[PDB]
């Protein structure tokens, strides 16, 4: 049972799904992730995804946290996000207010690739200027609250009521069924899995000979998750512009 | 019974006449185009149940009230579409159902003055839309209601915009095909 | 992923998924397949694209 997703295995298994990174960025990540993880005091830090931009400088986004705790029936991870445009130097991706969350939710299209740009919105005519990093952080928040996939019963609650890896996890009995996976923020033993999601928003392809399942999000096309059952590893990645697929009812 | 003809091709009436005026079954054949009518008459006016073949081959079979299509009837249009239901003042009006031939879709429910205003629109596969449609002002375009798609069995309620963009009130859910 | 699934009932598509995939291929191949500028020379008597033997990369 893994303790943390491995970026090498993620990039190896999800390359068929087109979720790839540049070679220079791959090396740069191999160096930069440990540095930032140590100098931020975090226990976990991984590559969350890669958002494409109009000028060719895609945003790499990394997500880290220290400990996850059960609060109000949800497994809350106090996560912290960082962004980068070369894979070597990570900057903070600061949270956004709730009022601005709606405005950035109204902004669509592929991001510009210039962290200093700000878009404009008009309301009753009061104009707001929303920084691009705000739009980025909210798209990341939406995609994160939508997917955040882990296997079912891979976590467990400890005496201090904290969510820790279940080191005696044996694996998913039926890896080709959506019941084997769940959201990260669902408490262990709560029985809520991906099958409770809106029917038709997930696809699962399972290679029963090699034992590798791929779970693709259809609501957010670009989110891929993999689960290897013979080695008991798993991990996910987002690659794409970050916009939700609203025409899903017409495409199924 | 006088087969009163009208030289100009010219008209050819072949039926019954009660001292000139027409009454009863007859076959009146216009000569300008070829439109024929076989059916009943009253005071010479086409009245009662009577089949008509128009110049463009659009066939009609149903009721007439004083030379105009009225009451229940069935029309076959030149392309292949079919309508069955209530006519009024020579158009679609009241309740009826229209079947397209190309897409094999159908519209069922309340019409108003040749256009579709309320009811259901079903596809060849079972998917459907239900609710308020445009009408004759529009071109029977959907306006406000719910979509059910059969392949995914999904159901979303909403409306359209002036451009035609579908605007959902909420996210889809799993439901059934509007047997109301 | 199945070459004989139904595409859609309305709008009436004339074929199975194989024809829809062939259509997507035909659109993408014309909208996105490119070569570097000046690599070929366009003939005006035809559409045959012969390459100029003098093209500095």
């Amino acid at each position: 049972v893994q303790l943390e997703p491995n970026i090498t295995l993620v990039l190896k298994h999800l390359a068929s799904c087109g979720a790839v990174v540049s070679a220079e960025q791959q090396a740069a990540l191999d160096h930069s992730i440990p540095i930032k993880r140590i100098e931020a005091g975090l226990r976990s830090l991984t590559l969350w995804g890669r958002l494409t931009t109009l000028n060719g400088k895609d945003y790499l986004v990394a997500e880290g946290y220290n400990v996850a705790s059960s609060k109000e029936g949800a497994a809350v991870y106090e996560t912290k996000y960082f962004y980068s445009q070369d894979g070597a130097r990570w900057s903070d991706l600061q949270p956004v207010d709730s009022e601005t969350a709606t405005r950035c939710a109204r902004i669509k299209g592929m991001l510009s690739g210039d962290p200093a740009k700000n878009y404009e919105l008009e309301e009753k005519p009061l104009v707001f200027q929303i920084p691009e990093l705000a739009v980025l952080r909210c798209r990341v928040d939406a995609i994160a609250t939508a997917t955040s996939v882990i296997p079912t019963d891979s976590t467990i609650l400890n005496a201090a009521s904290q969510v820790v890896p279940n080191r005696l996890f044996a694996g998913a009995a039926y890896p080709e069924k959506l019941e084997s996976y769940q959201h990260r923020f669902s408490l262990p033993g709560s029985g809520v899995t991906l099958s409770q999601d809106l029917r038709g928003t997930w696809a699962v392809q399972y290679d029963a000979f090699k034992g590798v399942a791929q779970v693709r999000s259809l609501l957010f096309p670009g989110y891929f998750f993999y689960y290897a059952a013979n080695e008991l590893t798993w991990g996910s990645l987002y690659v794409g512009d970050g916009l939700r697929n609203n025409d899903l009812i017409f495409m199924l | 019974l006088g087969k009163m003809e009208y030289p100009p091709p010219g008209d050819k009436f072949e039926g019954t006449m009660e001292h000139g005026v027409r009454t009863g079954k007859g076959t009146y054949t216009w000569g300008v185009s070829g439109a024929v009518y076989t059916g009943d008459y009253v005071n010479g006016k086409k009245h009662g149940k009577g089949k008509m073949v128009y110049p463009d081959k659009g066939v009609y079979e149903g009721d007439w009230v004083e030379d105009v299509m009225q009451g229940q009837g069935t029309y076959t249009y030149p392309n292949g579409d079919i309508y069955q239901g209530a006519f009024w003042a020579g158009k679609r009006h009241g309740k009826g159902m229209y079947h397209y031939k190309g897409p094999c879709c159908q519209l069922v429910g309340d019409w108003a003055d040749g256009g579709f205003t309320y009811g259901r629109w079903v596809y060849a596969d079972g998917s459907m839309f239900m609710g308020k449609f445009g009408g004759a002002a529009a071109d029977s375009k959907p306006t406000a209601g719910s979509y059910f798609y059969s392949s995914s069995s999904l159901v979303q309620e909403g409306h359209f915009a002036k451009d035609g963009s579908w605007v959902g009130h909420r996210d889809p859910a799993v439901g059934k095909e509007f047997s109301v | 992923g199945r070459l004989d699934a139904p595409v859609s009932a309305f709008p009436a598509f004339p074929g199975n998924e194989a024809n829809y995939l062939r259509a997507l291929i035909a659109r993408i191949s014309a909208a996105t397949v490119c070569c570097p500028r000046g690599f070929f020379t366009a003939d005006d008597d035809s559409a045959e694209l012969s390459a100029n033997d003098e093209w500095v990369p």
Binding site: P221 | Y54, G90, G114, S140, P142 | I28, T32
Partner: peptide
């Protein structure tokens, strides 16, 4: 080279409306 879902982007797609019901002969 192409690698993707085959979905054109641009936001210029919306559901198709029914074909116009044929009008009668005498217009």
């Amino acid at each position: 080279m192409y690698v993707g879902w085959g979905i054109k982007a641009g936001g210029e797609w919306s559901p198709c409306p029914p074909p116009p019901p044929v009008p009668q002969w005498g217009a």
